[PDB]
């Protein structure tokens, strides 16, 4: 039982977008579906919902601009969005509610919307390299962006343990940046190569930066 | 319009102890039209309650739900560092329903002196006319610190930023960076490049520094 997303990116105000979630193990049309969504400082905001029926409703926030609809063939639920605004910028989810049967059990991964009309800037990729107690730190910096997010890994992703990957920062100049590091024992890194992978989807870029001690 | 008040907005309690969160309603709503939910940094909230005390499938016995009417009370007992998360209460009975305003559970634990490093900027940047230094402080509790970036034994101001992370799920530590950014002419002009950390934790402040090239 999945529900999956996909349309999220960055729109400027007043564009529309159409958010989808395809569903896999329970029908749409079966079911009470939600829209709920997370913005920054937010908390969770419950959207819209639509009956099993297809009746709908919204938030105040939304009414007017927002539709939610299904496609019982594909078993897919939307949420058109029109008239979009700043305030709209958020991770949307897509859920499954019971009601009093149940609660809100099933969710989606979330797809981030941006309402913006500033320029997409995809990131510069540093290393942060020792210039060399037995641990050592490894980072990269990931600067000058716009919009959030980016996503940072290491070696893939099969390093995951020690690593941090800091807030980024709103700089005076409108753009974002941070810095990911890992800390990894000294005696590997004449062992093996270490390399930090981000990726901008607003730019549909994907950097992988080599990060070797100097 | 029914609206959901939680409380505490944060709550600090070290591993072992129990969470006690609330949730009130604007009006009477029924234990049947409420649920809780936990949601960990970066991951879609979960659901564990429903109906305000019946565990959804899965959810272990440490989450118990209880209350009647406007008032509504979640326990977290048996409480661990991956228990950090915000917890929100919701009610369904308007369409569409509302959540709470979240309770951030925050695990407590004893003073962790930072690991310091620090990070010339790279030749790449360099080549570009601008240098970046990075002073990561790793893994310390709690989150206050002070840095202090010294260049050729000159404190510098101005030219600095800080991020923290959230608390990790593992260990219940902070990490840091602070970004001192400089031109390449003027990176250029100096040689000792340092960033001293205060914190509770050390018995004395910890420099680490590097001389440019």
């Known amino acids: 039982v999945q529900l999956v997303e996909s349309g999220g990116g960055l729109i400027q105000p007043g564009g529309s977008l159409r958010l989808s979630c395809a569903a896999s193990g329970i029908t749409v049309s079966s079911n009470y579906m939600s829209w709920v969504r997370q913005a920054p400082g937010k908390g969770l905001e419950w959207v819209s919902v639509?009956?099993?029926?297809?009746?709908?409703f919204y938030a105040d926030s939304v009414k007017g601009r927002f539709t939610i609809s299904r496609d019982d063939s594909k078993n897919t639920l939307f949420l058109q969005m029109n008239s979009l605004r700043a305030e709209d910028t958020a991770i949307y989810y897509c859920a499954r509610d019971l009601y009093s049967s149940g609660g809100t059990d099933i969710w989606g991964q979330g797809t981030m919307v941006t309402v913006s009309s500033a320029s997409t800037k995809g990131p510069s990729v540093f290393p942060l390299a020792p210039s060399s107690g037995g641990t050592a730190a490894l980072g990269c910096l990931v600067k000058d962006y716009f919009p959030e997010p980016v996503t940072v890994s290491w070696n893939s992703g099969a390093l995951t343990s020690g690593v941090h990957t800091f807030p980024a920062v709103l700089q005076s100049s409108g753009l974002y940046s941070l810095s990911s590091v890992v800390t990894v024992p000294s005696s590997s890194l004449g062992t093996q190569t270490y390399i930090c992978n981000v990726n901008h989807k607003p730019s549909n870029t994907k950097v992988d930066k080599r990060v070797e001690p100097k | 319009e029914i609206v959901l008040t939680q409380s505490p907005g944060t709550l600090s309690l070290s591993p072992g102890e129990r969470a006690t969160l609330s949730c009130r309603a604007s009006q009477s709503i029924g234990s049947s039209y409420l649920a809780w939910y936990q949601q960990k940094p970066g991951l879609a909230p979960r659901l564990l309650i429903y109906?305000?005390?019946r565990r959804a499938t899965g959810i272990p016995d440490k989450f118990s739900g209880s209350g009647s009417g406007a008032d509504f009370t979640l326990t977290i007992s048996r409480l661990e560092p991956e228990d950090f998360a915000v917890y929100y209460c919701?009610?369904?009975?308007?369409?569409?329903?509302?959540f709470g305003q979240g309770t951030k559970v925050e695990i407590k634990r004893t003073v962790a002196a930072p690991s310091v490093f620090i990070f010339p900027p790279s030749d790449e940047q360099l080549k570009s006319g601008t240098a970046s230094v990075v002073c990561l402080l790793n893994n310390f509790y709690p989150r206050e610190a002070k840095v202090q970036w010294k260049v050729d034994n000159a404190l510098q101001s101005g030219n600095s930023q800080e991020s923290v992370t959230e608390q990790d799920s593992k260990d219940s530590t902070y990490s840091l960076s602070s970004t001192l950014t400089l031109s390449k002419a003027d990176y250029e002009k100096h040689k000792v490049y340092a960033c001293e950390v205060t914190h509770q934790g050390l018995s004395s402040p910890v420099t680490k520094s590097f001389n440019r090239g």
């Open positions: 639509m009956y099993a029926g297809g009746s709908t």
């Open positions: 919701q009610q369904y009975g308007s369409s569409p329903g509302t």
């Open positions: 109906g305000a005390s």
